[PDB]
Scaffold this active site. Structure first.
Site, PDB file in Angstrom:
ATOM      1  N   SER A   1      -2.744   1.366   6.481  1.00  0.00           N
ATOM      2  CA  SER A   1      -2.020   0.416   7.314  1.00  0.00           C
ATOM      3  C   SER A   1      -2.964  -0.161   8.407  1.00  0.00           C
ATOM      4  O   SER A   1      -4.133  -0.436   8.103  1.00  0.00           O
ATOM      5  CB  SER A   1      -0.735   1.084   7.857  1.00  0.00           C
ATOM      6  OG  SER A   1       0.004   0.204   8.697  1.00  0.00           O
TER       7      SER A   1
ATOM      8  N   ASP B   1       4.901  -4.266  -0.142  1.00  0.00           N
ATOM      9  CA  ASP B   1       5.137  -2.849  -0.342  1.00  0.00           C
ATOM     10  C   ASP B   1       6.247  -2.300   0.548  1.00  0.00           C
ATOM     11  O   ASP B   1       6.318  -1.086   0.801  1.00  0.00           O
ATOM     12  CB  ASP B   1       3.830  -2.070  -0.116  1.00  0.00           C
ATOM     13  CG  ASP B   1       3.399  -2.022   1.349  1.00  0.00           C
ATOM     14  OD1 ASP B   1       4.052  -2.638   2.217  1.00  0.00           O
ATOM     15  OD2 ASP B   1       2.387  -1.326   1.614  1.00  0.00           O
TER      16      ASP B   1
ATOM     17  N   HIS C   1       4.689   1.413   1.004  1.00  0.00           N
ATOM     18  CA  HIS C   1       3.860   1.644   2.173  1.00  0.00           C
ATOM     19  C   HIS C   1       3.853   3.090   2.633  1.00  0.00           C
ATOM     20  O   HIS C   1       2.819   3.602   3.123  1.00  0.00           O
ATOM     21  CB  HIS C   1       4.378   0.756   3.322  1.00  0.00           C
ATOM     22  CG  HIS C   1       3.365   0.527   4.381  1.00  0.00           C
ATOM     23  ND1 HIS C   1       2.285  -0.301   4.193  1.00  0.00           N
ATOM     24  CD2 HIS C   1       3.264   0.999   5.650  1.00  0.00           C
ATOM     25  CE1 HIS C   1       1.563  -0.347   5.300  1.00  0.00           C
ATOM     26  NE2 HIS C   1       2.136   0.436   6.197  1.00  0.00           N
TER      27      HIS C   1
ATOM     28  N   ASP D   1       7.304   9.072   2.106  1.00  0.00           N
ATOM     29  CA  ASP D   1       8.506   8.893   1.280  1.00  0.00           C
ATOM     30  C   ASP D   1       8.187   9.468  -0.095  1.00  0.00           C
ATOM     31  O   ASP D   1       7.080   9.270  -0.581  1.00  0.00           O
ATOM     32  CB  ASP D   1       8.809   7.405   1.136  1.00  0.00           C
ATOM     33  CG  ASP D   1      10.211   7.167   0.586  1.00  0.00           C
ATOM     34  OD1 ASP D   1      11.194   7.486   1.300  1.00  0.00           O
ATOM     35  OD2 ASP D   1      10.304   6.701  -0.552  1.00  0.00           O
TER      36      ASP D   1
END
Ligand SMILES: [Ca+2]
Ligand SMILES: [Zn+2]
Length: 378
Positions: free
Chosen positions: A106, A310, A351, A358
């Site tokens: 990121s 994403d 992401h 996740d």
């Protein structure tokens, strides 16, 4: 060279968040996997909401040791403290000719690029200001330092993300922070008295109070200079801010650059929008992906190429800096090339899945990081 992991606009140290790791999340501990397989790996924790500049100054002190120095000129321009926290230094070997591989997710990828640029070239503004005002100068601003061998970016908004353009972006961005806390089983409405998640905002004089919920703290941050100034992750995350960063943060000819892109959407046949796939993290799927997959803005050149995403960043932004950049980007061909972006491909992972925050059982996250570490070691 050892690997150093660097988070984006959320992220925290290994002892924070009750030990739930940013690098691995619900899947495990990526640093541990790498160390267990012979790849010596360390983790940085810098201000998640702070500017890339502030984060690069923090990363530098964390790596070599000493007191964070944001630059006298910079601190004066933005009205924050010049000096920050003091670190013992994770890697004193970098003061003895050692080098590192940085793996960044990121906005971490913007920070890593900027750290290279500052190491290599320093800052002329800081050098001149120190001369003019007879103050000290951090070695980071001198130039002629070379300790980063490679920068790998994963789902990085090198050209920004259009998410920042969303109507209630301020509130939704902090709801995203809350969604990430929830993934760690940390509640945003609980009056924690332990630190849990330090935003590292010493330079701005901001800190959560014991017993202050994250909900209440985030309402203070929204109104603070780490949200309302140009010296912020927020600014650098936008298409316009990322382009300004790209104008000065260039690929060093002495460093290998690798990018990984992410996408988690399908294209609708009727209006060409992108829609989130089954399995995308619930928050992105509901709050962010519909906007990212449908927002166009012809005056900024945000066209259909920007719709694939994403859940947080437009896929097109990720292969390397393009807008305002002279960096070259080439498809990976089996041999890493120095001084350019080696585009390592696009992965069907969202992401937060790509760092394990996740779940995604069909993504072999361990194999992904081990394959990358091999590529860097070869
Ligand atoms: Ca998932
Ligand atoms: Zn600053």
């Amino acid at each position: 060279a050892p690997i150093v992991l660097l988070h984006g606009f959320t992220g925290w140290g290994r002892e924070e968040m009750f030990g739930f790791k940013y690098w691995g999340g619900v899947r495990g501990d990526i640093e541990q996997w790498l160390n267990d397989n012979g790849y010596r790996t360390y983790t940085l924790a810098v201000g998640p909401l702070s500017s890339n500049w502030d984060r690069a100054c923090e990363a530098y002190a964390q790596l070599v040791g000493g007191t964070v120095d944001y630059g006298a000129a910079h601190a004066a321009k933005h009205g924050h403290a010049r000096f920050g926290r003091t670190y013992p230094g994770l890697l004193p070997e970098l003061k003895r000719g050692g080098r590192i591989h940085i793996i960044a997710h990121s906005q971490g990828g913007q920070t890593a690029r900027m750290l290279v640029s500052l190491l290599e070239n320093g800052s002329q503004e800081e050098r001149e200001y120190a001369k003019a005002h007879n103050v000290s100068l951090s070695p980071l601003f001198e130039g002629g330092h070379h300790f980063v061998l490679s920068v790998t970016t994963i789902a990085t908004p090198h050209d920004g993300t259009t998410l920042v353009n969303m109507v209630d972006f301020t509130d939704r961005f902090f709801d995203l922070q809350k969604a990430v806390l929830e993934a760690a089983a940390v509640a945003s409405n609980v009056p924690y008295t332990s630190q849990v998640y330090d935003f590292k905002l010493d330079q701005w004089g901001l800190r959560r109070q014991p017993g202050e919920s994250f909900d209440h703290y985030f309402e203070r941050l929204k109104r603070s200079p780490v949200w309302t100034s140009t010296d912020t992750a927020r600014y650098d995350l936008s298409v316009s801010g990322a382009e300004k960063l790209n104008q000065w943060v260039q690929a060093s000819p002495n460093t290998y650059y690798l990018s990984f892109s992410t996408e988690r959407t399908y294209r609708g046949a009727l209006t060409g929008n992108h829609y989130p796939e089954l399995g995308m993290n619930a928050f992105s799927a509901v709050v962010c992906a519909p906007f990212l997959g449908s927002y166009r803005n012809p005056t900024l050149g945000i066209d259909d190429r920007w719709l694939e995403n994403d859940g947080i960043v437009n896929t097109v932004s990720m292969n390397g800096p393009k807008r305002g950049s002279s960096d070259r980007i080439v498809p990976y061909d089996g041999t890493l090339k120095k001084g350019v972006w080696n585009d390592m491909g696009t992965y069907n992972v969202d992401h937060l899945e790509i760092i394990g925050v996740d779940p995604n059982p069909s993504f072999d996250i361990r194999a992904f990081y081990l394959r990358l570490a091999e590529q860097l070691a070869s």
